[PDB]
Amino acid sequence: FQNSLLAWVPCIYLWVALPCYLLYLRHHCRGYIILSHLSKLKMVLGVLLWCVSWADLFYSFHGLVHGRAPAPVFFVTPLVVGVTMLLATLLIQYERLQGVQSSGVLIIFWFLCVVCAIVPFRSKILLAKAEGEISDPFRFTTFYIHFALVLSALILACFREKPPFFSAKNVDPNPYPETSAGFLSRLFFWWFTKMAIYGYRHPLEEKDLWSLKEEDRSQMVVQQLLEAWRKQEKQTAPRPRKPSFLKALLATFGSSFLISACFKLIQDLLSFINPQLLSILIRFISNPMAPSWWGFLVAGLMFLCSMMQSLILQHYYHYIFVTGVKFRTGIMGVIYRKALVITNSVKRASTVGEIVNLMSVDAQRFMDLAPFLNLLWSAPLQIILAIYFLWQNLGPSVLAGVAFMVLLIPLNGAVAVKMRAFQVKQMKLKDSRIKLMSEILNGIKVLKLYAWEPSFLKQVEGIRQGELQLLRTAAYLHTTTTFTWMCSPFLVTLITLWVYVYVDPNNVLDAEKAFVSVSLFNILRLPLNMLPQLISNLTQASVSLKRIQQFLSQEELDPQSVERKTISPGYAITIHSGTFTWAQDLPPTLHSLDIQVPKGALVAVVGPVGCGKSSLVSALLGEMEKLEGKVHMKGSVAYVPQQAWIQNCTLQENVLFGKALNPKRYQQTLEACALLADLEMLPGGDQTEIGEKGINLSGGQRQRVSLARAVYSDADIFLLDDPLSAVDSHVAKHIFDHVIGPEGVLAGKTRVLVTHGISFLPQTDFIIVLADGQVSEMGPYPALLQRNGSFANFLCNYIGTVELSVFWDYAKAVGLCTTLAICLLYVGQSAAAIGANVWLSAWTNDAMADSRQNNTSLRLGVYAALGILQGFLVMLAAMAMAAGGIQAARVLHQALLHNKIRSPQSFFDTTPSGRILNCFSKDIYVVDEVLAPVILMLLNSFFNAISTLVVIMASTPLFTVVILPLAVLYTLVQRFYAATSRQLKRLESVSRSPIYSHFSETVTGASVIRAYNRSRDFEIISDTKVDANQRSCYPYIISNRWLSIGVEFVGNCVVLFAALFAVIGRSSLNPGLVGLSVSYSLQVTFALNWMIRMMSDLESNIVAVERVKEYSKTETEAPWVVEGSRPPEGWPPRGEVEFRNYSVRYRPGLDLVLRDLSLHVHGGEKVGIVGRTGAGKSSMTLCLFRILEAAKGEIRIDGLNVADIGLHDLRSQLTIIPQDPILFSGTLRMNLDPFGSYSEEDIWWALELSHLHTFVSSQPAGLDFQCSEGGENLSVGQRQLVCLARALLRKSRILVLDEATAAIDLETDNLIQATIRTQFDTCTVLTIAHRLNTIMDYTRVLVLDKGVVAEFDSPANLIAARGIFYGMARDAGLA
Ligand SMILES: C[C@]12CC[C@@H]3c4ccc(O)cc4CC[C@H]3[C@@H]1CC[C@@H]2O[C@@H]1O[C@H](C(=O)O)[C@@H](O)[C@H](O)[C@H]1O
């Protein structure tokens, strides 16, 4: 304060200039100054002046070493200049979105900046240069740079701004509240409040999100990127390398990535202020003479400079996540414009699944790279400028310090890539298990209709046990991610202290280096343990951008192949010298073809299969490339692919397909195609969802849908490529009569047809034959009838939060003896760490007057033995918790499965089995291995934060009052976030998939999308469907920030109230305890924002356990073993069946199926049940095996009831032929005997009796032959022969046949009936009536009427009585 004390003229000015002036920017609202690059320069030069105002500040702090404490006004005024011009930069950025033609105050700002500088300048311009050479070199260079930059600021402020052209108040949806938001309210992210309130008192549905801001509508961002890629042309203005996606991607985000480097720089280069004020405070309290206001100022400025660096960081993640989302959109939308205009040979070259995999992967790989990408230059600058401080403050003993972190990184990458093969590439066991789960789910019926369930229980338990034995070795080595985060700080401190002590004996320890080091390492190791993730994402994203660049350099034949301007009059379809080839390396399918077609007539193309008929239509659409020839298409086009294309939406727009709904015309098209017959089946009618979403409409129906689309779209030329392949003749003829032919609606259309039919030919106006891709004849049908030349060839040829109870339940799964040995053991480890630190504190203070310094050889020792325990009593937690997790997964899966098979048939009847299949796939993988590490890290961060909040308390025992707000505010903000972020996570996960589902539907229908020139009006459906994703992924990004302003505010009030309370009790403390209490208070604002990044992430994964508890306790009601009351065995041979008024229904509350049925059956009595087909005799078959339980009456077999026996002993003594013979996927060994209890000779003998011995003998392995999924690789007759072989093996004395003639071939049905007559002559046989011809043979027959018996009699006598049996026998034409 000698001559430059006046430098405070500008600063305080702002603190009165800002508020009063700011109101002028609020009374007038919009303004919207346009951004000229002069504004960008005005911004960035402020940042440069800021960095020099940092350089002089750390030159002032350099005085800390070499002897003196800094002079009073040296470490205050540069740091107020460097916050005032930060405010200047922020105000520039804010008026960038305002409307001031000129400031009127910032002008005075710069004027006074020059005024307060020239007078000091005039006093040293000649008083320091001619006197010598030194002239306070750094302090003078600072003035020189400041002078140059302020002169630039003045000359840039001499300008004037353009007229506001402010705005027009267009619409009032929910606007994205960054526009129309005060500067002070867009700094603390406070404008999000008005939604976080509504995210906790209400549910959120899509209509209540932000209406996305006008900059990004997914088509003003893909426009820029696509144009930049266009700038990568051949560049008319070396090695062929012209394609360069990276250059064009970089050249369109400079204004959003170099604005996001003037924040990370300011932040990290600013965060090194706290580890210097800490040394200042420690040095202060060590001196009991300095006035207390010095300490108060240092504390109150520590808080400010540790908050304003926490507000130019949590205001940087916003700008570096919005850019990630902009990547994820700009690529998802430029991958699309190419996917619409590919050449179908390229589509042949790959699979549509991987064309999708260019999204959800390789394009979602970005936005997972943007947060880390900026770290490339931060990692050195946050190291080489943080190694300097330690090497300046602990001597060259920090070599080992950072060396341990550097060594850790490869040893944290190796045992993270070992999992990339030992934990994901060994999960083919999971795929086999889920395929087996789908195998035993689809077909559970037949498996339950008789025995063999426990065999499959064991056969899935084997793979479960194997894969869990694997995981025992796959989570044990997942305890190297807790080792880092809760042993690297302590261990590196131990190593560096040990080396520093034992390098020389005359460099004694003291607080102002040990504690500043232990607090500066904390700053060092956040942007150093997130380095392995960077080095992995760079690899797995450079592998991705390579593939994206590859897929974007392909072939497009759109520009011109079939011109549409000049057409010969009187002709509509004309080709001259038409040569068409599918691929340049393929033979030419069509050779110099010359086809001319008139206007409005009918033309068809005939010939052998694939001789050019399935290629001409492709060539006409311009899809197929041409070597020579001229084609002239006139007007609109319609095209019906052989493989119908159906959009995953409602049928009405699947037929409307983007045109105005004409009602009468729409129903005319619907009725002409005769879709009404199918339409009546649809529940929602024309508004029913269609496609992958729901019912798999038959190709014979989807072809009708596509034809209706074509005819409604009333184009002028129709192309038909075998549109009646699965459409039956009786309906196809009417389709042609009402639509295609001149008698149809399309009389005045230039229709073209590709056919394999015959009766369609005679009424055709014009026929062209084709063969070998070369035309051979042409003309009207009679011209080809009499010739019988080329035509003869084909003439002959053809939501609330989870309740706490669930958590306890999970603990019960882990085992209380373990889950009570973890929380206790973490308490132990926290005690060990807090003891180690409070021991280091008592080590530091000893050096003040220690007259026996040899004691320093002891403390260090016990330090190791006080933290190695903590470095070993957390491994005993992580290993034990991994073991508990795998054990809990084992027990939970065992219970879920072991209970689900036993569930009654009704459950699988009502449940859409695929939902059961999502479990064993997703809702148990989550429980298995993405919930135990989450437990580890949650329960680990919690005990890392309790250690801090207890150590600060124990060090400075007086700030107990302040912890009450520091808890109530924290829990309040955590509750609000846990509501809103969870809601948004759900609402974004819901809408993520429909993007990918809308893709994989346009690549396949690439050709169908064209030929209606609807491609252009089809991106506007793609981009709106990613806009509906973005508007639920922006607020998530600005809801994970508004938390970290209500957290990194508490985590800094705890720094203010640690330092200030240390100062207020200076006389009662020592430097060691204060260094401890401040060094860990500075560290808590990270270990307390890391305890919400997971305590609100586990809340979205514990739900899995919830589901695995809802899919249980489902009334097994199937006691298989009642051994105390076994029936006497060996009662097939008696073979007596006796119903006694047995009354049964499907479910309690459902209709009554059977009504007091009674019967009298003896051994060998072949009996069939007759009645009305569809009455539910299958229900009676199910009752025989107790699939449905009676409410009255019972079934007595040989004097033995069915309700007093275990289910398996019951079902084992019977024999069934299921109506659908299923074939378990795999060998024939288990498909005949999963238990393998029947010898090879018996099985071969029975297969000989099965009359499939020839086919299996022809097979190489015979019984070891592999069966495809659902037994698809064997013929139908083979399936029935397999099921009857299954029946033959067991060979009981009771048979009950079940409708083996649903849609089963008769040629093998004769064999089945003959066999079951032959070998089953000594067994009681039931039979369900699907045919009256073959039931005229059994000795006796049951007559049944939906639950009431009529008689037991022979068919010869039943027709004589002239009853229902006779009526139905006569209705079949047999009497
Ligand atoms: C990258 C993350 C943010 C920044 C942290 C970070 C920054 C810099 C740095 O050098 C190191 C680290 C360490 C770990 C990083 C966090 C992991 C998940 C999160 O990533 C995103 O967070 C978003 C949000 O809530 O804003 C979520 O919305 C997104 O879904 C999520 O992907």
Ligand SMILES: C[C@]12CC[C@@H]3c4ccc(O)cc4CC[C@H]3[C@@H]1CC[C@@H]2O[C@@H]1O[C@H](C(=O)O)[C@@H](O)[C@H](O)[C@H]1O
């Ligand atoms: C980033 C982590 C989760 C969140 C914590 C966090 C969040 C927000 C925040 O502001 C600060 C911090 C501090 C440290 C962060 C953790 C370190 C490793 C972990 O990240 C790991 O990555 C693993 C992988 O994908 O291979 C996954 O298993 C898990 O996500 C996890 O184990």
